[PDB]
């Protein structure tokens, strides 16, 4: 490479590194590709070969201040200098963690009140099952422990959180889902299997069968329900008009308790500092990871409403110190990465930018790309957007899986100096850039984008 | 304080933290006290009123190079700042992890090939569990799917990886343990049932015990047995003489897994580089954390023998791309971490120190506190060490739970400038110092621990 320390690098990487997400043979075999990542800045990152790319999806919609950040490198080198590690247990903390527990609670919706820390996604929806049983067994309700997915969610790639996950990759194979876990419709208004229906209605549906399996289930059963405000790898789909609404009037109706899943929605990408209140959602439990320190350090949240808070403490004063802990729960060099990103959120207005500047780029990707016969549908909401193909628009004919034509458009892009995600099961272009993105930025996004969507597709 | 800058932090930290393995209701309350935590070298730590401590458990058996090495400190700053992230989703890395993994591999038993980073030593026990899985359902086998565990193990703070966990704390009102985890008989000599049994005659009465479980259950049935080479959590206890060498005969016997939970033992702490070949354990998983970073930034990994490797691959090649990634995985600055961590126990020869200190250690203990009255056993290996109170020593009778005896001499000895841990389930106190403990400091350690114990029982 240009930029490569060792000459080894192609050897170990296949011989020795188990990637996530990846093909185990073809990348031992030397058969599929590899990209060693060696700097960024701004919106831009690049190899150990010296190439360039616009990312414009900000790493895993996780990457949200941009890239090369100082202030944030600052704050983890300070305190990796002065303490990178003492345990949380039993009362201990640092100034950084309590800070930033302080920071979260100022931002969510009123009425948190607390911060469990965690290092993944996936352990904050570990942590909130375990929180859902708890409180329900301190309730004197043993069997209140059923707990409602959709399909296509996505909440983590564990045992339990890939059962909460309503995507067959995270399940063939593994044995999931598992129970106590149930899975209702898909929020997803362009795959509605009754076109005649208008958003309103389709949402009236959503809730309907969301009604009919708790009575089915049994209410007293039904001890929670688990949604991303907007899908995020189920295929970047905000909900239809009404969702929230008639969602949460059922939820209410049988005494279930909502986590909002905002991993990717929390701090800013839709242009609200809390998808929940994007959207009207009054929640239980907040899930949040990625863009709270806009992946600088790994970090997760669970946010806890005070009226199930006061529950726990009720179970703690008949149970005694919970039983459940990380060791690097509250790590200090993550916890002050999360202080520094939120102050540079605010300093930089990401949250403005990202519901401005992703209203003018979620325009432009429409036209430029909207009008191609093969495109159903431009789609998304503040900082994030996608394109769906089709091989027929009037009958909403879908391509045969095998002919990869998300992966084909993601893979023209990408040539191109431009990276998007070819999402999961469909045909589907995905965008989360960094909430810095400048409209000049956008319009080298779109415009390479309808290059790669025209090249494809003749 | 005097190192504090907010006047603000009791507050903050008791209306918002919800801290690990705390009482909910005193902290928030403010009746049990906190620490906050502000610096640290060698083996001392301070907090931000300036109190400092020497630290016999090294956080929590974690910070083993010691505090303070700019060495580590300066690695995760030099990463931080070039790229503090990318995913290694798709065959994507960094010069780091890619190195890091050569290096675990490297110093593993050979046999060992490729590694899978996480985060926390639990996510890597919910990695090994999927994969145990997944292995079986590629060779046909979907009804090899158990996984026995042990009593007093501890392997998580999860829903699977509590319910592998084998102490009640992290099962209780958590309706844990689910299927299909089993767990046999705590590898615990003190404890046997029958007095009369030498430490072999114990050994194998374990093994019988169970090969017993396999067969009532059906060996059809049983995918894995998961031990930590010596117990951490569940009360510092080394094996007794000849347990594992009986205990894989007997898993041979019947096809099942090896899964060797090394998140404590992982590069050193037992005085040679794994656990595993200090007591002749030849595993197909490897669980690490911990040591692997000495805590300078959060890290997990999954070593992957290589014949379960090879049957892995075969898998990709039928069903794809890996349906299991976390979004941190391979994080760059913790990869970094783990690169200086290694260098560093080689620099300072911990693994030597640990093993020839660590016997110092033990043997000093022995001779201050094995003939008190209440001190029922003084027990350990390499630089793990702990002392079991009982009521009796002639009749083995132990005090009441409600009597917090371990908690009082641990609260003593911390009193006195020393921390050391009560350990969960008994009256034990324990210790895990930095594998850089001098023979001096081991000497103070000891002194107060013996000053501790004389006062808690005169």
Same mark, same amino acid.
């Given at each position: 490479?240009?930029?490569?320390?060792?000459?080894?690098?192609?050897?170990?990487?296949?011989?020795?590194?188990?990637?996530?997400?990846?093909?185990?043979?073809?990348?031992?075999?030397?058969?599929?590709?590899?990209?060693?990542?060696?700097?960024?800045?701004?919106?831009?990152?690049?190899?150990?070969?010296?190439?360039?790319?616009?990312?414009?999806?900000?790493?895993?919609?996780?990457?949200?201040?941009?890239?090369?950040?100082?202030?944030?490198?600052?704050?983890?080198?300070?305190?990796?200098?002065?303490?990178?590690?003492?345990?949380?247990?039993?009362?201990?903390?640092?100034?950084?963690?309590?800070?930033?527990?302080?920071?979260?609670?100022?931002?969510?919706?009123?009425?948190?009140?607390?911060?469990?820390?965690?290092?993944?996604?996936?352990?904050?929806?570990?942590?909130?099952?375990?929180?859902?049983?708890?409180?329900?067994?301190?309730?004197?309700?043993?069997?209140?422990?059923?707990?409602?997915?959709?399909?296509?969610?996505?909440?983590?790639?564990?045992?339990?959180?890939?059962?909460?996950?309503?995507?067959?990759?995270?399940?063939?194979?593994?044995?999931?889902?598992?129970?106590?876990?149930?899975?209702?419709?898909?929020?997803?208004?362009?795959?509605?299997?009754?076109?005649?229906?208008?958003?309103?209605?389709?949402?009236?549906?959503?809730?309907?069968?969301?009604?009919?399996?708790?009575?089915?289930?049994?209410?007293?059963?039904?001890?929670?329900?688990?949604?991303?405000?907007?899908?995020?790898?189920?295929?970047?789909?905000? &909900?239809?008009?009404?969702?929230?609404?008639?969602?949460?009037?059922?939820?209410?109706?049988?005494?279930?308790?909502?986590?909002?899943?905002?991993?990717?929605?929390?701090?800013?990408?839709?242009?609200?500092?809390?998808?929940?209140?994007?959207?009207?959602?009054?929640?239980?439990?907040?899930?949040?990871?990625?863009?709270?320190?806009?992946?600088?350090? &790994?970090?997760?949240?669970?946010?806890?409403?005070?009226?199930?808070?006061?529950?726990?403490?009720?179970?703690?004063?008949?149970?005694?110190?919970?039983?459940?802990?990380?060791?690097?729960?509250?790590?200090?060099?993550?916890?002050?990465?999360?202080?520094?990103?939120?102050?540079?959120?605010?300093?930089?207005?990401?949250?403005?930018?990202?519901?401005?500047?992703?209203?003018?780029?979620?325009?432009?990707?429409?036209?430029?790309?909207?009008?191609?016969?093969?495109?159903?549908?431009?789609?998304?909401?503040?900082?994030?957007?996608?394109?769906?193909?089709?091989?027929?628009?009037?009958?909403?004919?879908?391509?045969?899986?095998?002919?990869?034509?998300?992966?084909?458009?993601?893979?023209?892009?990408?040539?191109?100096?431009?990276?998007?995600?070819?999402?999961?099961?469909?045909?589907?272009?995905?965008?989360?850039?960094?909430?810095?993105?400048?409209?000049?930025?956008?319009?080298?996004?779109?415009?390479?984008?309808?290059?790669?969507?025209?090249?494809?597709?003749?």
């Amino acid at each position: 490479g240009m930029l490569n320390q060792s000459n080894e690098l192609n050897a170990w990487d296949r011989d020795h590194f188990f990637h996530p997400s990846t093909h185990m043979g073809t990348h031992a075999r030397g058969e599929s590709p590899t990209r060693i990542m060696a700097g960024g800045e701004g919106v831009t990152v690049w190899d150990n070969n010296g190439r360039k790319s616009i990312d414009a999806f900000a790493g895993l919609y996780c990457v949200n201040v941009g890239y090369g950040r100082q202030k944030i490198a600052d704050a983890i080198a300070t305190q990796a200098k002065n303490l990178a590690y003492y345990h949380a247990y039993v009362g201990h903390g640092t100034e950084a963690s309590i800070t930033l527990a302080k920071m979260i609670i100022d931002r969510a919706p009123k009425g948190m009140s607390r911060v469990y820390f965690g290092l993944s996604g996936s352990d904050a929806n570990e942590t909130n099952i375990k929180l859902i049983w708890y409180y329900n067994n301190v309730l004197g309700r043993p069997e209140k422990k059923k707990i409602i997915s959709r399909w296509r969610g996505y909440h983590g790639s564990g045992v339990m959180t890939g059962s909460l996950t309503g995507l067959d990759l995270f399940h063939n194979a593994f044995d999931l889902p598992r129970a106590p876990v149930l899975h209702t419709e898909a929020p997803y208004y362009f795959r509605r299997t009754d076109r005649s229906m208008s958003e309103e209605q389709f949402s009236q549906h959503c809730a309907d069968k969301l009604e009919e399996m708790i009575l089915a289930e049994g209410p007293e059963t039904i001890a929670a329900f688990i949604g991303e405000p907007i899908l995020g790898t189920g295929g970047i789909v905000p &909900p239809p008009a009404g969702y929230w609404e008639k969602i949460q009037a059922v939820l209410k109706k049988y005494d279930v308790l909502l986590v909002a899943d905002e991993v990717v929605t929390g701090f800013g990408r839709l242009g609200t500092m809390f998808g929940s209140d994007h959207y009207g959602i009054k929640p239980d439990l907040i899930t949040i990871a990625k863009g709270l320190t806009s992946a600088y350090a &790994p970090l997760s949240g669970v946010i806890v409403a005070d009226r199930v808070w006061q529950v726990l403490v009720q179970g703690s004063d008949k149970l005694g110190s919970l039983g459940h802990g990380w060791t690097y729960s509250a790590h200090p060099i993550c916890v002050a990465a999360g202080v520094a990103n939120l102050e540079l959120i605010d300093e930089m207005d990401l949250v403005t930018n990202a519901g401005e500047t992703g209203a003018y780029f979620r325009a432009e990707l429409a036209k430029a790309v909207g009008g191609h016969k093969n495109v159903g549908e431009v789609r998304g909401d503040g900082m994030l957007a996608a394109v769906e193909f089709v091989a027929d628009k009037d009958d909403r004919v879908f391509f045969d899986a095998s002919q990869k034509i998300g992966p084909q458009v993601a893979t023209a892009l990408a040539a191109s100096g431009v990276i998007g995600r070819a999402m999961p099961q469909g045909d589907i272009l995905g965008f989360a850039p960094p909430l810095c993105l400048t409209r000049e930025q956008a319009d080298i996004v779109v415009s390479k984008t309808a290059d790669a969507v025209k090249s494809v597709f003749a």
